[PDB]
């Protein structure tokens, strides 16, 4: 089975550069996949960070693109993420993921081919572009075709890339206005021609400030295939703070059933482990999520016991802070 493992720090100093790596198992990174990163703040939803394509091409969420760098190392079967000038706002659980061109199996003998463009579909004047036609294994000829002038180009330079797929590449060294248009793929296999692929628009952008354009402006697709995240890593929690290691201050909380508690104030960093009577009391406990009290953490933990057991028997809260290597016990004594 396919596994993705995140690696990196837990803590990152404010205005620093966060560095994460994803180790891929049961697959090859050098395949038709989009190796991606997603992040989730402590109480928020999911935010798409960016992705890296087989061609080495990168796409990043505009919200934060300037601070983003996604790379891939085929030799080590891994991909990485670097984040510059990190602030408290960059606090989250970071996930590495695999995006795949999933297909509901409709055809098996001659499946409908796919058309892609590298580096993209919006090419500057005079620059190059390559179309990649994808089909099943055993194709003898691939054909690229133009809509407006209905010109075509055939190739027998076919190469197997996976146990199920095969491909051909068509390069235009220097694009002009008359090269822009709609392009498709069709292949010949076993005395038969396939169904033609979907069209893919190629635009050649002008060399001036005034140049401007079913996706948004310039947000033209680069493939007829839709990529979907089908595998997620379990995630790595990253905390961005200029704070120092600080052990907690443990304060007791005294008032048929009775609720007692403990206040765990001013520590850095999360987590803390709170137990009651060394785990013997567990059925009625509530430990609350920590809040940020001026760059230090604070939490409370409540315990509910019968009135017959307290103050007649001792109730103690056990507070452990692994980071500072501290382990404290606090007895709950009554008030008048």
């Amino acid at each position: 089975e396919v596994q993705l493992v995140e690696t990196g720090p837990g803590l990152m100093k404010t205005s620093g550069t966060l560095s994460l790596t994803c180790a891929v198992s049961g697959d090859y990174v050098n395949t038709n996949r989009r190796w991606s990163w997603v992040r989730q703040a402590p109480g928020k939803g999911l935010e798409w960070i960016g992705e890296v394509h087989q061609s080495g091409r990168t796409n990043y969420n505009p919200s934060l693109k300037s601070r983003v760098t996604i790379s891939v190392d085929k030799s080590k079967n891994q991909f990485s993420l670097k984040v510059d000038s990190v602030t408290a706002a960059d606090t989250a659980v970071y996930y590495c993921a695999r995006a795949s061109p999933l297909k509901s199996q409709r055809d098996t003998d001659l499946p409908r081919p796919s058309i892609s463009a590298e580096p993209g579909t919006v090419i500057p004047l005079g620059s190059h572009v390559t179309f990649v036609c994808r089909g099943p294994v055993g194709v003898q000829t691939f054909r690229l075709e133009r809509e407006r002038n209905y010109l075509y180009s055939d190739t027998e330079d076919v190469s197997q890339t996976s146990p199920s797929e095969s491909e051909a590449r068509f390069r235009i060294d220097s694009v002009n206005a008359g090269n822009a248009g709609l392009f498709r793929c069709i292949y010949y296999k076993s005395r038969k021609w396939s169904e033609q692929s979907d069209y893919l628009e190629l635009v050649v952008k002008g060399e001036d400030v005034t140049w401007a354009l079913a996706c948004p402006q310039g947000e033209l697709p680069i493939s007829t295939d839709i990529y979907y995240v089908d595998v997620w890593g379990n995630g790595t929690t990253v905390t961005v703070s200029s704070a120092k290691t600080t052990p907690p201050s443990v304060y007791p909380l005294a008032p048929s059933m009775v609720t007692l508690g403990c206040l765990v104030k001013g520590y850095f960093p999360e987590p803390v482990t709170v137990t009651w009577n060394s785990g013997s009391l567990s059925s009625g406990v509530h430990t609350f999520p920590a809040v940020l009290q001026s760059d230090l953490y604070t939490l409370s933990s409540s315990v509910t016991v019968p009135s017959s057991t307290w103050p007649s028997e001792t109730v103690t809260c056990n507070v452990a802070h692994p980071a500072s290597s501290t382990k404290v016990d606090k007895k709950i004594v009554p008030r008048d």
């Binding site: 509901s104 079913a214 947000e219 304060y251 005294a254 508690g261 604070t298 939490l299 509910t304």
Partner: protein
């Protein structure tokens, strides 16, 4: 392209048939995926291409839609189905997620158990004074907390904390802390913690003097 999921929260019980909506700001054909996220866990792909079930997902999960409106239907709910659900557009860059819909367990209404605690003698003999209040095991989620010092409302120095739906009794809990100096705390007598919740017209008041 903005994705708008509705409702933000839905309450149901096991065995029930439910439906979640996802709306796109522009036509996106059938290029929509559904993800499932259980508390404490990593996401999981359920549905791709609006209507296609990913390999190994139960037939209870059904996805439907084209263009701008997309629906997720779970018929005959099981305990493991109470989770957060996100929809995602995958046609245009950036392929942005919806804000999520949390599916929670609809249990019987339950009032909060309110407890107030004065500063500890150890915290005080160090210059600090935190007044802690607990609002435990209440249903539904919607609750309002208020602090009163000598009959006067107080908002400054108040820090609140909410637990997720309890995995055992399906209730919710909340902790509110009013923090001040030993000097400031020693100038007043009456400290109140007031809880307003669906289960009562009159708020629950818990006080201490000195």
């Amino acid at each position: 392209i903005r994705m708008t999921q509705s409702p933000s929260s839905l309450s149901a019980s096991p065995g029930d048939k439910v439906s979640i909506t996802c709306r796109a700001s522009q036509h996106i054909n059938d290029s929509l995926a559904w993800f499932q996220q259980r508390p404490g866990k990593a996401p999981k792909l359920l549905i791709y291409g609006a209507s296609n079930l990913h390999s190994g997902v139960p037939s209870r999960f059904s996805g439907t839609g084209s263009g701008t409106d997309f629906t997720l239907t779970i018929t005959g709910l099981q305990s493991e189905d109470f989770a957060t659900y996100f929809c995602q557009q995958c046609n245009c860059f950036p392929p942005d997620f919806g804000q999520g819909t949390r599916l929670e367990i609809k249990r019987a209404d339950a009032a909060p158990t309110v407890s107030i605690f004065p500063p500890s003698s150890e915290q005080l003999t160090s210059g600090g004074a935190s007044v802690v209040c607990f609002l435990n095991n209440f249903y539904p989620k919607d609750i309002n907390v208020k602090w009163k010092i000598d009959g006067s409302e107080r908002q400054n120095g108040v820090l609140n904390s909410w637990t997720d739906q309890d995995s055992k009794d399906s209730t919710y809990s909340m902790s509110s802390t009013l923090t001040l100096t030993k000097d400031e705390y020693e100038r007043h007598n009456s400290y109140t913690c007031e809880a307003t919740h669906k289960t009562s017209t009159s708020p629950i008041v818990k006080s201490f003097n000195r």
